């Protein structure tokens, strides 16, 4: 349509909010796959940024393919290689969630302002497989990667 098509020429990026992501308790409810940007390029944002971002972008696409197979076939009948990429993907999509300072009043949890360097090294370590021993819920609603480890540590003490 002329209206959006004309507008799309001027856009440098997009941010698609989804109910599907919101229904999984993931706020902000930004769709990681559908949201895109022009400046996502090795030459513009560096080589490190592009590689880590594409790693998260790939593993979430692979997760969605493997998530279907679970519904069609079953829980097992999946190569151990896939079950690792599924487990890491569910940690990644939870680490994408973040508590905001704006929401402090009605939510209660403290907001976080994650720097660019902390964000990249956070997801980079998850793809490499450094925090595989940690659970899924440890990465839910936290700022930097340090709080994800500290949150996992507040279980085990006061476990169960």
């Amino acid at each position: 349509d002329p209206a959006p098509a004309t507008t799309f020429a001027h856009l440098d990026a997009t941010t698609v909010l989804s109910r599907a992501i919101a229904e999984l308790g993931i706020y902000p409810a930004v769709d990681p796959l559908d949201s895109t940007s022009r400046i996502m390029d090795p030459n513009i944002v560096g080589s490190e940024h592009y590689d880590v971002a594409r790693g998260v972008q790939k593993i979430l696409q692979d997760y969605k393919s493997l998530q279907d197979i679970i519904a069609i076939l079953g829980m097992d009948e999946l190569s151990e290689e896939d079950k690792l990429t599924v487990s890491r993907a569910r940690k990644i999509q939870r680490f994408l969630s973040q508590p905001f300072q704006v929401a402090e009043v009605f939510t209660g949890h403290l907001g976080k302002l994650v720097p660019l360097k902390e964000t990249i090294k956070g997801f980079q370590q998850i793809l490499a497989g450094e925090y595989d021993h940690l659970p899924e819920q440890a990465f839910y609603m936290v700022g930097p990667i340090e709080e994800a480890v500290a949150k996992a540590d507040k279980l085990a003490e006061e476990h169960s």
């Binding site: 829980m75 599924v86 487990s87 569910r90 021993h133 940690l134 659970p135 899924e136 819920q137 996992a152 540590d153 279980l155 085990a156 003490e157 476990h159």
Partner: peptide, 18 residues
Amino acid sequence: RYFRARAKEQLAALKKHH
């Protein structure tokens, strides 16, 4: 469900360790 159980198992591992 499977990974929900895995969360409890790994949490028991770090329970015994840390």
